[PDB]
Amino acid sequence: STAGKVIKCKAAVLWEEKKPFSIEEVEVAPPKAHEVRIKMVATGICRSDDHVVSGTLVTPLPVIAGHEAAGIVESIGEGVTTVRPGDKVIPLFTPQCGKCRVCKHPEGNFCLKNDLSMPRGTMQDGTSRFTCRGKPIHHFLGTSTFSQYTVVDEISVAKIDAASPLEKVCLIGCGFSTGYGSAVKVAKVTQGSTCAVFGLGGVGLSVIMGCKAAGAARIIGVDINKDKFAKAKEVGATECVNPQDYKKPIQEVLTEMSNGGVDFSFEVIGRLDTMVTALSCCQEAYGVSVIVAVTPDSQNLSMNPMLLLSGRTWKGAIFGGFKSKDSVPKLVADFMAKKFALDPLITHVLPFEKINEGFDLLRSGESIRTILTF
Amino acid sequence: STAGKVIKCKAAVLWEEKKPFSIEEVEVAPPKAHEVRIKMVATGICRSDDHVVSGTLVTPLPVIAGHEAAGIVESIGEGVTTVRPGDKVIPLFTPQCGKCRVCKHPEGNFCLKNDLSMPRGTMQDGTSRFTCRGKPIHHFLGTSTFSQYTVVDEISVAKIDAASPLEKVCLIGCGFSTGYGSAVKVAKVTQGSTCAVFGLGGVGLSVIMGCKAAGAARIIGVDINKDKFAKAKEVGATECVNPQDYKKPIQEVLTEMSNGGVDFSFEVIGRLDTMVTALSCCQEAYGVSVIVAVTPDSQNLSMNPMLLLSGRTWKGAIFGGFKSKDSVPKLVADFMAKKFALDPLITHVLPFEKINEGFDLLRSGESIRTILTF
Ligand SMILES: [Zn+2]
Ligand SMILES: [Zn+2]
Ligand SMILES: [Zn+2]
Ligand SMILES: [Zn+2]
């Protein structure tokens, strides 16, 4: 009744930069070969989506943003073997084609088929499945979750547990996995270790959860906003420090606190100065610092290579270093097995149509995570 | 006949900055508890020693420099158990006390007992064993190899094969191990991988040897001086590239050559701009770049954290990441077992008294490595 034909539905369309999202009636074309049309159930509002709005993250416009979500497959194109109609799925903004050098590399996850490096805003075949009043609308990171229905390439979708709560597990689409993975996959936090987390937002909390799951003895939360501390401690933080409370530089305070420097530090703010501070606070001989965020309007940080010569390791990653398709299902399984809680991260839930309001909450910073429901 | 009493000998003393080395008659006091007096046999002239001269590497003056050497133990102080009189040894500028957090850490080697971070220019007990005309002379990195005899703390000396050629294995004291280790221990080069080595001096060649021993399929030597290419190829380089031959930036050339970016890159020059270039040329998703050198007159490099967010790893190390005392003996064993050749690195051999001449060769750059013999 719906398969093989165009679907008329609503979607949040961004027509121009620095403009509010426009709830428009759009036409979502049927999935071609190796494609998957998905009926959205829930989608999170991530800072990256906002970067598209402010023109910070350059991608073709008009566009249907959104990359953190979960839904139900309504139909599949010819050749699709990984998912079936009715399956609960999560779109992967970072694809896993499984064929490129990166997918075949044991340490890589940034699939060369990504639309992040040089954004085209289309399906893998160079075209779009979206039209508004006969006018073509671009895709976003092969996901475009700000729509009641979306069409994604098979390499950009993962089948998850059929009994999982999509209003919660949608965070696995970006926020949670990014933070959690930075701790568990990128840094590879060891038991009894001391960790320092800069920035206690949603991703920051997820990093803490990862350090906790990894068995870190100490997890020091760092944030200039004291209101973020309670949640941080609730999710795993042993201590919380505010740089504004001190007269001496924060890396100095952290070095003293950890008697020589922390084992693992994470920068989850995307600020040039704290990235350097995060690196500097980890132990000089074996300290590991992970870059979990950087603003799209790329500016250069200033740093002394001496910090690295002593023995430190500096590394970053997208999607917490997780090979998307392989990891997402297992992360949902862990959530289903009660291995971790996602509720502490959800601070607001609004119906999809109030998308602009959800962004006001994001921009104001009073929201850890707003989830849009369909 | 010599043990327990002061030894009168010659040493190259640096009285002031930017001054030539002064061959002076000095008094080397007998080794106290857990100390070792060594009769020097050979010592290399490393750029770091020159940094002491130009005041770049700040350490107390007057001083007896030199940290890359090999010799014979003439006597030991009470409590010494690792070496005995007559033993062939190599002083360790990077100590291995085996007790501090770093020594006990599986990834650390920069022993907290080092005199590099905050130079005191003395023995571990805060005093000196050197006097020239009744005037106290400082030590250097717990080694001071520019003397016919030196006294070092037990944690700063390693016993090596009694049949090894000290005129050659002395390179294990710094140069060779630093380069070799950066490839074999820090970067952990894998078989069939593609490597890029910036700077083809002694340490640069040693990195190549490490990549070769690690089974790298491609080892691209990079240097603006073509005269360094032959030796590079001789030791393992598959290709040699000169940045002055090209119109486009070098990281671009290297990215194209390696079809997407190299697996491992090493900066062995100590230049802020090439460090960034070296990082940028390794693959974005799983590339590893190693900082093998940085000038003591620390200046900040400028870099975009985006290079790291994609998945790259940036790391540096001292003494090639080798836990000094444990590694040195095994490296000599490997040399003795013919696992690698040290001769290609030795370009000049001069008697100890012509030390200043050896530095002229170093400063002019016409020398890969000058070895001083006693
Ligand atoms: Zn996101
Ligand atoms: Zn791929
Ligand atoms: Zn040296
Ligand atoms: Zn130690």
JSON list of C-alpha atoms in Angstrom, two decimals, chain B residues 193-197 208 211-212 216-221 229 232-241 257:
[
{"chain": "B", "resi": 193, "resn": "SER", "atom": "CA", "xyz": [52.45, -0.82, 5.53]},
{"chain": "B", "resi": 194, "resn": "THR", "atom": "CA", "xyz": [53.49, 2.46, 3.92]},
{"chain": "B", "resi": 195, "resn": "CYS", "atom": "CA", "xyz": [55.78, 4.77, 5.92]},
{"chain": "B", "resi": 196, "resn": "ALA", "atom": "CA", "xyz": [56.98, 8.34, 5.44]},
{"chain": "B", "resi": 197, "resn": "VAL", "atom": "CA", "xyz": [60.18, 9.55, 7.14]},
{"chain": "B", "resi": 208, "resn": "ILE", "atom": "CA", "xyz": [63.90, 3.61, 8.25]},
{"chain": "B", "resi": 211, "resn": "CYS", "atom": "CA", "xyz": [60.26, 0.29, 9.41]},
{"chain": "B", "resi": 212, "resn": "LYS", "atom": "CA", "xyz": [62.28, -2.25, 7.38]},
{"chain": "B", "resi": 216, "resn": "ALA", "atom": "CA", "xyz": [56.93, -2.09, 5.85]},
{"chain": "B", "resi": 217, "resn": "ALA", "atom": "CA", "xyz": [56.13, -2.52, 2.15]},
{"chain": "B", "resi": 218, "resn": "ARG", "atom": "CA", "xyz": [56.98, 1.11, 1.39]},
{"chain": "B", "resi": 219, "resn": "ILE", "atom": "CA", "xyz": [59.33, 3.50, 3.16]},
{"chain": "B", "resi": 220, "resn": "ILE", "atom": "CA", "xyz": [59.32, 6.97, 1.63]},
{"chain": "B", "resi": 221, "resn": "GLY", "atom": "CA", "xyz": [62.31, 9.06, 2.65]},
{"chain": "B", "resi": 229, "resn": "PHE", "atom": "CA", "xyz": [68.94, 9.80, -0.48]},
{"chain": "B", "resi": 232, "resn": "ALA", "atom": "CA", "xyz": [68.38, 6.24, 2.89]},
{"chain": "B", "resi": 233, "resn": "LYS", "atom": "CA", "xyz": [67.78, 3.77, 0.08]},
{"chain": "B", "resi": 234, "resn": "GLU", "atom": "CA", "xyz": [70.77, 1.72, 1.21]},
{"chain": "B", "resi": 235, "resn": "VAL", "atom": "CA", "xyz": [69.19, 1.27, 4.66]},
{"chain": "B", "resi": 236, "resn": "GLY", "atom": "CA", "xyz": [65.63, 0.51, 3.54]},
{"chain": "B", "resi": 237, "resn": "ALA", "atom": "CA", "xyz": [63.93, 3.41, 1.75]},
{"chain": "B", "resi": 238, "resn": "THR", "atom": "CA", "xyz": [61.94, 2.35, -1.31]},
{"chain": "B", "resi": 239, "resn": "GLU", "atom": "CA", "xyz": [61.56, 5.93, -2.52]},
{"chain": "B", "resi": 240, "resn": "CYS", "atom": "CA", "xyz": [63.02, 9.34, -1.81]},
{"chain": "B", "resi": 241, "resn": "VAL", "atom": "CA", "xyz": [61.22, 12.61, -2.26]},
{"chain": "B", "resi": 257, "resn": "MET", "atom": "CA", "xyz": [51.61, 8.67, -3.68]}
]
